[PDB]
């Protein structure tokens, strides 16, 4: 069972420098007197790592509390331990560290190691209550206070302890590397006696492999398991803990790095070099030796990657007579519909959506958000004053009086149905009966068919002969549009837009995103559909009025005409080149010089 401790209070982070450590055997092969280059997850040289006291006394009173934050686990972790009295005991791994996601424990008592992955319920301060015996004291008893409960256990492993016993300055360094790739939880280990060095010692030490585990879980966050020698019920004034946590543990974060490892005739890594540190090391990696002679070598290449984007594209003056339809005065009757044609215009569909004024927004065949992007060939517009409960019947694949008798909607409908009301504008106190609606027809219609005939339908067997009477009715009845009618009986201004997507030239297109102009900076540019990377400079060339572009002798674009501003701009590809290192023999000096071929010294 877990016992609550005091707050961590978010102690400030502290940094130190790691000098050539974390070098572990990257594979399981034997190499003798050879230089091998490996690209994998490692600790950078002279990298800056975060170090925590096991116990800190930060309060003015002298409160002894642990430095046990839960730290992020990204692409492996290097964990160093300078310790003397066996106070760090294990590690927790997972994503949530709760009863929601599977979590892994490694713990080390005096006898063996225990490794599990289950559904643990983890407390805020897991720890191990460690106490000595009253007679022997040779070993210690550990009471686990790490998790509340465990379920769905999927692995178990017990073997020789990872940490050796430490039972007055023989502090030792345990260097560990933990990685997770392809369901593989790998631990590489090494221990070394240290003397009179508070931080990591300077030197090299190969880290041998210790175990691989097929846990196969997702792990993003981890914590450090530590041991209470004291009592949480009665915290002593001082010395109840272990020398106020002089024992320390260091955390470094691994990255994909390249290393040149030198295997000797033993197959022990006696030296390594990282290729990304400094140009001297880059030269050593590219030449595949630890010593370079006096001369000049070429290591890599730079390209000056662009920093932003620009797009310009001309906008036509006239837009559309959308306001002639949507904001019209008089509308058509439902028996004699008003199709309107829209072509050779730029259609602003952001206006209709941002209007936040139309009740129904249902576009079929085209997503609502993308009307301005893609454009079409021809547009047909209809907009009417239909009753409210007859709104849902304008979408293809439907049944209803209007949906069956008046106007068919083909299933393969690419377009939009967008509706709202017309109460304050199309209703009158005496009722607006100028809209005539059909309820009787001889047969159902076809998609996009129009009938305006006013023939009297024969409900019975005798012919009407255009004259009403028994079993004879006029085709059209008028609606009682009143401002006091209920929601369904209200007048409803509904719009149907039918678009044409054909293998034909496009005459209607959407609004075009045009941005600001940037000069003398490498940028990705899109002029009238031409996309590229370059730096745009003011050009003296003169274009004839009907010309737009310019090419060199070698079929490469070099000059362009800005559509909005009639200036003429020329393009230079963004400066790149090779990088060379001038260096004398490594046996004489370790300083180098860099030379960038065929570029100007401003972009560097």
């Amino acid at each position: 069972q877990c016992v609550n401790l005091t707050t961590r209070t978010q102690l400030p982070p502290a940094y130190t420098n790691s000098f050539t450590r974390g070098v572990y055997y990257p594979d399981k092969v034997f190499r003798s007197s050879v230089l091998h280059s490996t690209q994998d997850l490692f600790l950078p040289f002279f990298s800056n790592v975060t170090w925590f006291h096991a116990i800190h006394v930060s309060g003015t009173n002298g409160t002894k509390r642990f430095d046990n934050p839960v730290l992020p686990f990204n692409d492996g972790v290097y964990f160093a331990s300078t310790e003397k009295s066996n106070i760090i005991r294990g590690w927790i791994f997972g994503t949530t560290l709760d009863s929601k996601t599977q979590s892994l424990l490694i713990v080390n008592n005096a006898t063996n190691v225990v490794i599990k992955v289950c559904e643990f319920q983890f407390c805020n301060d897991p720890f191990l209550g460690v106490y000595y015996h009253k007679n022997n004291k040779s070993w210690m008893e550990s009471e686990f206070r790490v998790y509340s409960s465990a379920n769905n256990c999927t692995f178990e492993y017990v073997s020789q302890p990872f940490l050796m016993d430490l039972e007055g300055n023989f502090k030792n360094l345990r260097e560990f590397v933990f990685k997770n790739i392809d369901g593989y939880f790998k631990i590489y280990s090494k221990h070394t006696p240290i003397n009179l060095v508070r931080d990591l010692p300077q030197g090299f030490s190969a880290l041998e492999p210790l175990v691989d585990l097929p846990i196969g879980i997702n792990i993003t966050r981890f914590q450090t398991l530590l041991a209470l020698h004291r009592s949480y019920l009665t915290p002593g004034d001082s010395s109840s803990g272990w020398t106020a946590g002089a024992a320390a543990y260091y955390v470094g974060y691994l990255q994909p790095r390249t290393f040149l490892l030198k295997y000797n005739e033993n197959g022990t890594i006696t030296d390594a070099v990282d290729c990304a540190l400094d140009p001297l090391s880059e030269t050593k990696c590219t030449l595949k030796s630890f010593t370079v002679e006096k001369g000049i070598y070429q290591t890599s290449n730079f390209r000056v990657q662009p920093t932003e984007s620009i797009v310009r594209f001309p906008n036509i003056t006239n837009l559309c007579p959308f306001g002639e339809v949507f904001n019209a005065t008089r509308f058509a009757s439902v028996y004699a519909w008003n199709r309107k044609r829209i072509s050779n215009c730029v259609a602003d569909y952001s206006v209709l959506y941002n209007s936040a004024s139309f009740s129904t927004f249902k576009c079929y065949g085209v997503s609502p958000t993308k009307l301005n992007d893609l454009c079409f060939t021809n547009v047909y517009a209809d907009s009417f004053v239909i009753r409210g409960d007859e709104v849902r019947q304008i979408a293809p694949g439907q049944t209803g009086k209007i949906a069956d008798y008046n106007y068919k909607l083909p299933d393969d409908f690419t377009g939009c149905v967008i509706a709202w009301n017309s109460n304050n504008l199309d209703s009158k106190v005496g009722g607006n009966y100028n809209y005539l609606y059909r309820l009787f027809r001889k047969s159902n219609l076809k998609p996009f068919e129009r009938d305006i005939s006013t023939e009297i339908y024969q409900a019975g067997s005798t012919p009407c002969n255009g004259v009403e009477g028994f079993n004879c009715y006029f085709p059209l009845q008028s609606y009682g549009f009143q401002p006091t009618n209920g929601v369904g009986y209200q007048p409803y201004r509904v719009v149907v837009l039918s678009f044409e997507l054909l293998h034909a030239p496009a005459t209607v297109c959407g609004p075009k995103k045009s941005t600001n102009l940037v000069k003398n900076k490498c940028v990705n540019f899109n002029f009238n559909g031409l996309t590229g990377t370059g730096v745009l400079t003011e050009s003296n060339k003169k274009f004839l009025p009907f010309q737009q572009f310019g090419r060199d002798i070698a079929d490469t674009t070099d000059a362009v005409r800005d559509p909005q501003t009639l200036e003429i701009l020329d393009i230079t590809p963004c400066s790149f080149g090779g990088v060379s290192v001038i260096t004398p023999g490594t046996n004489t000096s370790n300083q180098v010089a860099v030379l960038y071929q065929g570029v100007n010294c401003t972009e560097v």
Partner: nanobody, 127 residues
Framework: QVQLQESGGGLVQPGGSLRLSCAAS????????IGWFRQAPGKEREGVSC????????NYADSVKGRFTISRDNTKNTVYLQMNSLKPEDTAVYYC????????????????????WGQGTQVTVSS
């Protein structure tokens, strides 16, 4: 396939509390504002409480202020309300309407078209 469904109606005591929810299937409800309306026996359908598409703008009738709380979850696509201290004047049929505002403003004070309507549920307060 646009469908609106009520959940949580029933019989309670005056002064009590209950929670009603409108769920929906066939389309997403984050774009729509959703209002709650009620029809009393012999009375017209009144506006009980409206909430915007993003939930930042809300409307309560003067008779329902301080007892009703409207809310929505756009992630799971439902709209909730909590009524406390119920009265016999609140027993009626109850509806959820999802639509888009019709005028140039952010609030939802006024009424407009009521795009999609569920079948409703009965809320009864009597003791």
């Amino acid at each position: 396939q646009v469908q609106l469904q009520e959940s949580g109606g029933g019989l309670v005591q005056p002064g009590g509390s209950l929670r009603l929810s409108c769920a929906a299937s066939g389309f997403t409800l984050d774009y729509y504002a959703i209002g709650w309306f009620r029809q009393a026996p012999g009375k017209e359908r009144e506006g009980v409480s409206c909430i915007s598409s993003s939930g930042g703008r809300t409307n309560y009738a003067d008779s329902v202020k301080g007892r009703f709380t409207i809310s929505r979850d756009n992630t799971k696509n439902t709209v909730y309300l909590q009524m406390n201290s119920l009265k016999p004047e609140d027993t009626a049929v109850y509806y959820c309407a999802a639509w888009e505002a019709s005028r140039w403003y952010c609030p939802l004070q006024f009424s407009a078209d009521f795009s999609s309507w569920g079948q409703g549920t009965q809320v009864t307060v009597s003791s």
